[PDB]
RNA sequence: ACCCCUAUACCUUCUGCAUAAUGAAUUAACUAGAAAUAACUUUGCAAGGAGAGCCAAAGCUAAGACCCCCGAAACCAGACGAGCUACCUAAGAACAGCUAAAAGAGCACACCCGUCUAUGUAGCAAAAUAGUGGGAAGAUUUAUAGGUAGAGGCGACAAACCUACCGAGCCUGGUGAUAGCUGGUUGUCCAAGAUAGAAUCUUAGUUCAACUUUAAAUUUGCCCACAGAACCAAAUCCCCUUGUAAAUUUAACUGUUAGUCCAAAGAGGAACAGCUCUUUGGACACUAGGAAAAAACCUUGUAGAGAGAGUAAAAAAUUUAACACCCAUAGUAGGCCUAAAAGCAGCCACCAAUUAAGAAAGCGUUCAAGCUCAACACCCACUACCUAAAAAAUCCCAAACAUAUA
RNA sequence: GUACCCUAACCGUGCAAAGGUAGCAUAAUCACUUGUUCCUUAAAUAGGGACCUGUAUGAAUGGCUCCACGAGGGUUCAGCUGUCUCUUACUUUUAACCAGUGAAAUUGACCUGCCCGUGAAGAGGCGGGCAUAACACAGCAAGACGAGAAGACCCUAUGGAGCU
RNA sequence: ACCUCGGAGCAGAACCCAACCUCCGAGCAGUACAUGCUAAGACUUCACCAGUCAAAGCGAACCUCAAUUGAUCCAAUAACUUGACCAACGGAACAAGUUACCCUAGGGAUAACAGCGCAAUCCUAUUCUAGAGUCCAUAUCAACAAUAGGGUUUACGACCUCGAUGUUGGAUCAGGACAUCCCGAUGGUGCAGCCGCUAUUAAAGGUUCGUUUGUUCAACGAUUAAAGUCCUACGUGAUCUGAGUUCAGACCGGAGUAAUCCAGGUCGGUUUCUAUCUACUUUAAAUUCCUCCCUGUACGAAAGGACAAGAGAAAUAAGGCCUACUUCACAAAGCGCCUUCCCCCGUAAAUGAUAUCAUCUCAACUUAGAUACCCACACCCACCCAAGAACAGGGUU
């Protein structure tokens, strides 16, 4: 999202161009377990959103 | 970790025990249900766990009928009296069509 | 005879072994399924049968036919052991020479021990040899007898030593201890035969179910037509026909209940794993052909002989980047801002002369100045395929071949 | 909390039976750790001296010095030397050949090759290629997951035992 | 951490369906007092036990809730009835630690090393062009992100092996990859020269000695042309070592009532093998540094300061020999002496079409661009040897 926003905001002409998202903000949560953890022991904590 | 506990209960084995057209004797349980999915109709009684059993001996038929609750059933009457005009509720009902007559008159004496 | 072609010993264990997992040199001999309750079969007699006792609403009597071998560490009882060693008792013995002459003193033999090294490791030796060392008149060393014994002794505690495996000696007995664990389990031939699950000091086991096997009795069993199964996708349930021949019940038991990949729907993990967990379905643990070798992918199953035939599955194809030429004065250093910002720092407008040039699309200048594009003319004509990598460790890996009618 | 950092002679508060005293101190000492500084060496995670709530030192769980002593552990001057740079020569034993006597562990069967691939995942034996008359003697130790000891670690067992 | 019971998802539509999977709860409360008796037919948590609904009838009247729970024996009671956080919840009536002093039966059904799978982590290359670099993306570095590759780390998995696959560093011997540390060739530069930085090609040859530490590493000293990165069962213990690490002894600090323990420190501590099979046991072209001159030349304002060509001197490596030296002595050796010879491909240019210019050309085309050793062969009884384990070989005029 930052790549899209920065590239389009830099390259666009704000006097004759306009841009909108057709994709919502990151909402689906992705969880990661601790580094080096063995298999099992519950589901990992929420890391980020996509 | 895994701080979720419980949720180990088995399946209740509920649902339909007698489908369409099945010959059913008196007192046979037709359906077992946790909520009112199928309603009792003609010659079908309901037991306090909301089970459905046959009151007569015959053939099980599932129909779809209009729903008029008892005027003392407060929440159902509230839903009725908040429904818009021109609309009617429909529910699935279970009936037993009795196959045999109640009895016969036959000759026993020649007095 | 070899040379050609085919061909990954056996047993056990396992999801799966050519496995570089187990066992086996070989020969001969020895070496491992014992029985009840019932059931079934065949007789005898029969509302009774049996040579007392017992059973009997067709039973009773008799026979047949069914249940292995080896192995612990252990525990207890009674003996035998202190000729080794631990400590003790009785009475003995040895300790050269030198320092100083007193010493649990020093050097140093005999003697006692065993620090370090090397050799040895089925040895000379079930702890040795060689050198090097600690002590060597003392808490020393040692010969002889005797004592203390295992629920114990003895110990300058190393949980050491008690007749060469002492965290509890050895022998005999109980004893053919026990082993949900490993190993093994011996003629021939045929047939049926593959894994829902629940409990459990249970997950290396067992019991019940499920599946499987046999023998009986009976009538429906699989495939399924329409109608039908709830509010908050693939399908399934139910099911008459029809295609078929199996199903249920009764009797009697074992064994399997430590599971692998592939396709699909998901869950956990990294939208990792030849990962783990469920579900549907295949195949494998059974044969054969193919994908190189090959478990699980594809083809195909019911058995034999043939020097016959038709087939199934079955052999990877691809090779990519040329792009113009010629030209350019000028209203103006458009206005504002700034030291200047001149088409090109930032703003407003974007008109307008020449035939034809944006109040300038890139560069370039502190700013300037400069050079390219868009524009005239010029002319054959914009010629326009719209695409894109490379690495590892013994030695590349069939040989090869674009062109003779499917 | 209090004297620029640090640190509190000091003040306040709470608990305990008492709140670690003297001494020593980076230790034969949890982590920090190769603590900081000086000596020693050309060069020091070593050794010695010093500082140090040692945030887990410490007083017969004995604390700290000290004389002798130690096959105890560590450092070092000087010398010595095949320890090494860097190995060489000789003798004896061993060795190898002739003669006599004559074991053991091991051993499914073997007519017992190399490369790459495959596969119960590390092939002499399977696939594709390569190599290839037969047979002794000496040597080597890369492989035969070489031999030995039903793994000395780990787990399991409604298996044991010793100790508290 | 959990162990029993229930609801929702996973499991969308008959039933069922797991995970140390994702969430929510339960171990009651309230009413009644016919919450009496009895009895067809059914359901069923995949077994059993347990659990669930109920027509009719007698007698009266005219239960809510989702789980809300515990078997048998036995105990209390005259009887009816009532007894566990038996929560390890199908429950043994009542039993903890520790073991490195340990033992047994097994397990690669299960961990540690090694192999394998995977690549999260680690490493590399490209793509994009923000940004840094006075200006300038692309001399050099590089954000967000994308694509692809490697199998050196730490994991993760539990597939071979527990009727043994012995282990960290070191010695010895090294085989291989190139992602090159040096030497070679080339392109770019913010390359004047010397030095550099970056990229392409190149694996023939090379890649030091020491102090501390058991160390791999790391720091430091002194050099060198350089002191490469890896893989090879973290190559290599039937070739060696045993400092470390994880047996039995002991100490310190801490923990524990104690036995004992510490993924803490410290001192000590047995490394067996006679080779059966495979494999192998003599394959002659060497690299590098330094000195001189070129030359104080090119270049540069100066300071600084080359590349070619050529000459010499070494060092190592390979092969060999004893004249002298030295260990020594009919000889074997080094510390001594002698000899050692080809290229190597990145690219830079000329002519010239497709495309009548140009263009180094996956256009046709032009240029930069080995020899040596060995080689004959029943004299052989025997002797000698500079030949040799035996055998073989050479000499015996
Ligand atoms: C080889 N040594 C260092 C050793 C090591 C271990 N531990 C290991 O296996 C550790 N190895 C690792 C590092 C984990 C790979 C060990 O476990 C052992 C031993 C030694 C043996 C000695 C045994 C001895 N016998 C069998 C030769 C013996 O007679 C006695 C005795 N004193 O009587 C023993 O103590 C002995 O049986 C023994 O205990 C040993 C080990 O257990
Ligand atoms: Mg559930
Ligand atoms: Mg369940
Ligand atoms: Mg296995
Ligand atoms: Mg096979
Ligand atoms: Mg083999
Ligand atoms: Mg084995
Ligand atoms: Mg085998
Ligand atoms: Mg085994
Ligand atoms: Mg017992
Ligand atoms: Mg005696
Ligand atoms: Mg004395
Ligand atoms: Mg003395
Ligand atoms: Mg002791
Ligand atoms: Mg002890
Ligand atoms: Mg037995
Ligand atoms: Mg059959
Ligand atoms: Mg259990
Ligand atoms: Mg078991
Ligand atoms: Mg699997
Ligand atoms: Mg002494
Ligand atoms: Mg002999
Ligand atoms: Mg292989
Ligand atoms: Mg040999
Ligand atoms: Mg074993
Ligand atoms: Mg058990
Ligand atoms: Mg049931
Ligand atoms: Mg009634
Ligand atoms: Mg339990
Ligand atoms: Mg239970
Ligand atoms: Mg100990
Ligand atoms: Mg054992
Ligand atoms: Mg591993
Ligand atoms: Mg910039
Ligand atoms: Mg598994
Ligand atoms: Mg093993
Ligand atoms: Mg074996
Ligand atoms: Mg072995
Ligand atoms: Mg390269
Ligand atoms: Mg290794
Ligand atoms: Mg070896
Ligand atoms: Mg031991
Ligand atoms: Mg010692
Ligand atoms: Mg050895
Ligand atoms: Mg062999």
Solved by what technique?
cryo-EM
Distance CA B66, CA B93 (A): 10
Task: Give start and end residues of each alpha helix (H) in chain B.
Answer: 74-82
For tokens 């004496």, name the residue.
Answer: B109
Is B22:B60 a contact under the CB 8 Å cutoff? yes
Decide if A41 and B2 are in contact by the 8 Å CB cutoff: yes
Which sequence spans correspond to the domains of chain B?
A: 5-111
Q: How far is A14 from chain B (nearest CA, A)?
A: 52
Spatial CB neighbours of B81, under 8 Å, sequence gap ≥ 6:
none
Cα B97 to averaged position of ligand 10 atoms, centre (Å): 71
B5-111, which class in CATH?
mainly beta
B1 CB near a chain A CB, below 8 Å? yes
Distance CA A40, CA A3 (A): 36
CA of B52 to C1' of E216 (A): 79
């Amino acid at each position: 999202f930052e790549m899209m926003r920065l590239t389009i905001n830099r390259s666009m002409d704000p006097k004759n161009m306009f841009a909108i998202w057709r994709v919502p903000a990151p909402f689906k949560p992705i969880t990661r377990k601790s580094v080096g953890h063995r298999m099992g022991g519950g589901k990992g904590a929420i890391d980020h959103y996509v | 970790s895994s701080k979720n506990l419980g949720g180990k209960s088995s399946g209740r084995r509920q649902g339909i025990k007698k489908m369409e057209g099945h010959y059913v004797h008196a007192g046979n349980i037709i359906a077992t249900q946790r909520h009112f999915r199928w309603h009792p109709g003609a010659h079908v009684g309901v037991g306090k766990n909301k089970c459905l059993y046959a009151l007569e001996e015959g053939i099980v038929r599932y129909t779809k009928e209009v729903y008029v609750p008892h005027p003392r059933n407060t929440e159902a009457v509230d839903l009725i009296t908040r429904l818009p005009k021109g609309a009617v509720l429909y529910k699935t009902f279970v009936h037993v069509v009795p196959a045999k007559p109640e009895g016969t008159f036959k000759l026993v004496a020649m007095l």
